[PDB]
Amino acid sequence: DFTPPTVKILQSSCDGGGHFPPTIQLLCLVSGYTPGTIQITWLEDGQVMDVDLSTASTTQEGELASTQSELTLSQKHWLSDRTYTCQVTYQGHTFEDSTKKCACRGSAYLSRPSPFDLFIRKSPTITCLVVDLAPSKGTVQLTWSRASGKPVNHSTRKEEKQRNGTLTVTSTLPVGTRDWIEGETYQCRVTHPHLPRALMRSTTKTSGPRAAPEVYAFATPEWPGSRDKRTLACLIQNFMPEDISVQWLHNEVQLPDARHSTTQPRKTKGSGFFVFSRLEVTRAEWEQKDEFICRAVHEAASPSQTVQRAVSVNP
Numbered sequence: 021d022f023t024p025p026t027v028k029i030l031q032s033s034c035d036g037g038g039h040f041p042p043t044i045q046l047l048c049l050v051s052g053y054t055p056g057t058i059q060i061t062w063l064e065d066g067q068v069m070d071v072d073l074s075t076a077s078t079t080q081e082g083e084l085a086s087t088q089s090e091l092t093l094s095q096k097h098w099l100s101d102r103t104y105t106c107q108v109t110y111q112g113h114t115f116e117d118s119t120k121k122c123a124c125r126g127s128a129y130l131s132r133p134s135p136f137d138l139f140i141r142k143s144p145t146i147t148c149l150v151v152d153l154a155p156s157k158g159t160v161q162l163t164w165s166r167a168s169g170k171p172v173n174h175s176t177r178k179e180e181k182q183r184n185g186t187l188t189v190t191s192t193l194p195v196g197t198r199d200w201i202e203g204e205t206y207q208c209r210v211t212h213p214h215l216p217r218a219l220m221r222s223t224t225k226t227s228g229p230r231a232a233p234e235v236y237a238f239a240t241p242e243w244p245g246s247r248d249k250r251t252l253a254c255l256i257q258n259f260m261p262e263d264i265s266v267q268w269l270h271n272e273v274q275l276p277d278a279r280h281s282t283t284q285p286r287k288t289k290g291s292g293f294f295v296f297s298r299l300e301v302t303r304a305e306w307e308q309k310d311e312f313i314c315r316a317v318h319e320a321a322s323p324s325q326t327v328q329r330a331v332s333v334n335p
């Protein structure tokens with residue numbers, strides 16, 4: 021019945037080279053809300069900014085209103101690391117959103133759960149990988165959190181000393197199948213002593229369109245010299261989003277992942293991604309049962325998040 025106001029801040033984009041414009045415009049949006057008394061105030065480090073610095077406007081279309089306020093800042097003030105708060109008092113109730121310049125020296129990566137773990141195994145996990153760090157006295161702490169503030173499970177901790185003298189800190193967090201699918205956002209804070217401030221990475225399910233993959237499996241003809249082995253190739257394409265899991269099945273058995281090589285998802289010329297999978301098979305396997313299945317596990321695949329194609333060595 022009632023629609024509460026949603027506060028979001030949009031900022032001036034950087035150019036093609038990643039350079040800041042001469043002035044930064046912060047645009048506060050109070051979009052799609054039930055009409056009522058509204059006030060927008062801008063704060064610079066918790067202090068009320070002068071009315072002349074910002075310009076607001078309210079527009080009513082249908083049963084809902086939409087208010088916006090634009091604040092103009094100099095490049096000096098934005099680069100000074102000052103925090104800018106947009107304070108919206110709607111129907112006497114305060115709603116706030118804050119922003120500052122986005123937070124060199126060589127990195128952290130946060131992955132989404134694999135479609136196989138989410139849909140087949142039904143035990144998804146997210147991995148925070150922290151790389152390119154120099155050997156220095158003091159541990160590297162990785163902390164997991166949810167946007168909802170709900171509790172997280174206990175994670176794993178793998179530390180590896182690489183050949184080049186660098187260290188990799190791997191944390192694997194188990195997530196809920198129901199939680200991920202319902203759009204939970206998982207964050208991983210990297211508290212490092214050599215950094216001044218935390219390196220935070222966040223992950224959540226795909227936003228845009230979903231398109232099921234097309235699976236095609238091929239068997240190479242006999243090549244002179246390789247009479248007792250064959251190569252099976254699989255083209256999995258036109259899927260959206262890029263998140264895909266590939267498996268090869270022979271004789272009602274799922275072959276080990278070590279048996280095959282799958283490429284990384286690359287864009288097609290039109291819409292969607294593509295992957296290739298390569299499996300080397302022996303005469304003993306095809307003479308046992310001449311059917312090898314290439315299976316793709318994808319979120320857009322119906323009815324069970326799976327699409328597959330069989331291939332036989334001999335016609």
Ligand SMILES: *[C@@H]1O[C@H](CO)[C@@H](O[C@@H]2O[C@H](CO)[C@@H](O[C@@H]3O[C@H](CO[C@H]4O[C@H](CO)[C@@H](O)[C@H](O[C@H]5O[C@H](CO)[C@@H](O)[C@H](O)[C@@H]5O)[C@@H]4O)[C@@H](O)[C@H](O)[C@@H]3O)[C@H](O)[C@H]2NC(C)=O)[C@H](O)[C@H]1NC(C)=O
Nearest residue numbers: 127129131147149151152182183184186188282283284285
């Ligand atoms: C010192 O040496 C180390 C050697 O380890 C160098 O560290 C590597 O640095 C690069 C660049 O920073 C890292 O690459 C990133 O990896 C991100 C994470 O990707 C992994 O995890 C995914 C989820 O589990 C997984 O899918 C992915 O695998 C993919 O590639 C496989 C290739 O064989 C392929 O078979 C799979 O199908 C799949 O497609 C990865 O395992 C990724 O998101 C980034 O885009 C980026 O590529 C390496 O991970 C680092 N190595 C390790 C072990 O962590 C370091 O840079 C060297 N220092 C210097 C100065 O050169």
